Assembly symmetry: C2
Homo-oligomer: 416 residues x 2
């Protein structure tokens, strides 16, 4: 709400006032930063050493091993330190491959490209926002609806949500054993194509991480100097954070963002890059408080945009950028909501690199509040409320409906 009432042109003054308060509460902000920096440097060295050894620094598990409860305590600790995980064989390869063809048909038959070109204005900006598109405002294809409700996928999301410390001061901040569905888009990157994608960033808020008292509570051990107590997997306070209202706001708390692979994923073939450092955010928060940063500036952090990590202000973090592991169709990869990530710039592969966005979102009040309005958009075939009201699929042939839904899918979408 406080964020909801702050004008976009009052932000620089907001930042100036709040930065003074944080430097005053944490007078040794420099020494704390240097201590945090050393902890980060040690994670970076280890990641670079993994890469140099030919090991991918992103942890990998088999869905079967999750389902059968064979994941060891050391593996869970590794995932929590790296803040990410690739999970293989969630779906059979045959199914995912068919899913890929089906989404393609779905787009082909309903003339998506032609519709996108029409929905764009004659601006330079509009027009190849509407040609060679890579992210598709497509939400209700049967493969998306089937993928979200699958039992294996549910077990994997429950596993991941249980990595969090969900209980604090007598209160359950979310139910890790209960999954709700967050409908999202699908991406299809052609070989040899350029990238529109954002540079290394984190979704879920930018300036607000400093300006909002609720975000600052999530990060209380960072701003008080007790950085060793900061825990990225502590749930407390995260479903309560306030964001500047914008198209970048997600209505749901997601513990992990996720990709489900519809095609093989390879390095240098349009795959995902991450910085696998779960507590990188502490470095970023503290970085913006140093003396070499202007008073009304937070290292470029800006309204209505994902928080960016740059070579300019965070060259240490950039040293730890890594491609995700190779994936086959039916594999997945997940990353903590605070993990820095980025689509790689170039795709020199032979075929389209295609994925569905499918996150892990646990049951909680915040997330429960979004379900009814999301359900309405599903019922209508409209774009969900967190997205541009393109509403492409209202009249699409073969759009998925309530009748494609299992009982799991029904409960995850808030149909009782």
């Amino acid at each position: 709400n406080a964020m909801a009432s702050l004008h976009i042109d009052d932000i620089p003054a907001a930042i100036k006032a709040v930065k003074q308060q944080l430097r005053q509460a944490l007078p040794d902000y420099q020494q704390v930063f240097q201590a945090v920096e050393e902890n980060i440097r040690q994670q970076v060295m280890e990641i670079r050493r993994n890469l140099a050894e030919g090991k991918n620094p992103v942890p990998q598990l088999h869905a079967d091993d999750i389902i059968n409860g064979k994941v060891t305590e050391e593996q869970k600790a590794q995932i929590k330190q790296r803040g990410c995980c690739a999970i293989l064989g969630v779906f059979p390869q045959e199914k995912a491959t068919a899913w890929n063809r089906e989404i393609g048909d779905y787009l082909d038959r309903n003339n998506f490209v032609e519709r996108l070109k029409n929905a764009a204005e004659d601006n330079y900006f509009g027009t190849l926002a509407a040609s060679k598109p890579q992210i598709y405002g497509i939400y209700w294809s049967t493969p998306q609806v089937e993928a979200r409700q699958d039992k294996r996928m549910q077990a994997v999301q429950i596993f991941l949500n249980n990595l969090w410390q969900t209980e604090s001061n007598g209160k359950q901040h979310f139910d890790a054993n209960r999954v709700v569905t967050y409908a999202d888009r699908t991406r299809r990157r052609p070989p040899k194509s350029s990238s529109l994608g954002l540079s290394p960033h984190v979704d879920g808020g930018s300036i607000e991480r400093w300006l909002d008292e609720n975000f600052r509570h999530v990060y209380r051990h960072v701003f008080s100097g007790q950085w060793q107590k900061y825990d990225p997997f502590a749930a407390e306070g995260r479903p309560e954070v306030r964001e500047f209202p914008s198209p970048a706001v997600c209505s749901m708390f997601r513990t992990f963002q996720g990709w489900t692979a519809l095609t093989p994923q390879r390095t240098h073939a349009g795959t995902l890059n991450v910085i696998p450092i779960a507590n990188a955010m502490a470095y970023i928060l503290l970085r913006a408080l140093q003396d070499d940063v202007a008073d009304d500036d937070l290292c470029g952090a800006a309204p209505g945009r994902a928080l960016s990590a740059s070579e300019q202000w965070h060259p240490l973090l950039m040293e730890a950028i890594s491609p995700i592991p190779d994936l086959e169709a039916g594999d997945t990869v997940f990353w903590h909501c605070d993990v820095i990530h980025s689509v790689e710039n170039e795709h020199n592969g032979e075929f389209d690199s295609n994925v569905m966005y499918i996150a892990a979102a646990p049951w909680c009040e915040k997330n429960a509040a979004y379900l009814p309005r999301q359900l309405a958009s599903f019922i209508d075939g409209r774009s969900p409320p967190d997205f541009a009201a393109d509403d492409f699929e209202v009249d699409f042939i073969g759009r998925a409906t309530i009748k494609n839904l299992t009982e799991i899918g029904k409960q995850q979408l808030g149909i009782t």
Copy 2:
């Protein structure tokens, strides 16, 4: 319009695409920047030398000398190089001093402070946005209305607008001999108070100066490399520039922003700082294209905010920051719409430092289009449409009306 249709979360991709195009059109962007840099360095050295000699680098003229047409060609050239001018004795000191008392009474009697506190939410942000205020959402006091329509002030604005090259390719881009009124606020800075004010900045657009083809036309000689042909006082294209819709947008083209002093102004007493380099913008535009700037970044330029010049990206420009000359009540100071400026941080003076915002806005179609809707707000006592709809003075005792207006004031406000 193109700017009007660009989403706030599509900007980083917009910047990435446009920066590639500009570096490709200007492949020697580095060498051009270094040549521009040298030209700037020479203006900075001269300004610092002025300051070291105890001369203020902001040109000064007497209103009488303007009115009697005694300003020399060298003085006009100096104003055009420095991009600013202090103009003394526009109003008699006695009048301006009374004006100051009258605005004070006007605020006192109508309980402005108490009203502001009520119009603010119970946020940390809201509350001393509403106490110890420095900028007052006050538009229609009789001193403001009288000051805007004064004959001496009109002559001074016509003088300044005639400094511009108003004619190009058969077309008059604005009528320098015809003034229209732009109603604005009033500022009152108490001694020993902190500053909310923005760091060194330029109003009238930020990212759009690179992203909008119309802005890029104003700056065509910069982006083509022919920087020596760039002329800050060329009118062509400026009334056609497109801005990202925000509370920072001014509906009128102003050739100069301006302050009218209601109290004495002194250095270290809450006065104005400027960087008196009219073509500083060329350095700023080119700076953002260098190899040390990230692909989707324009040295911090951001939507809905004045363009900032920083120690971080423009330390050369910061070396040339200067206080405006000392002013008495009734004096004025004006600066080119592209001139970097900034309220000084500290006020160690003995009394309130108070000014009225009164710009120079020439007649042209763009400006003529705003007059009717501005007139409506004047008629109602509402906040003008470019400002927050506070509407404080609707029921204020002593608000100015159409009956306070001379025939000049009537014509400047679009009453035939």
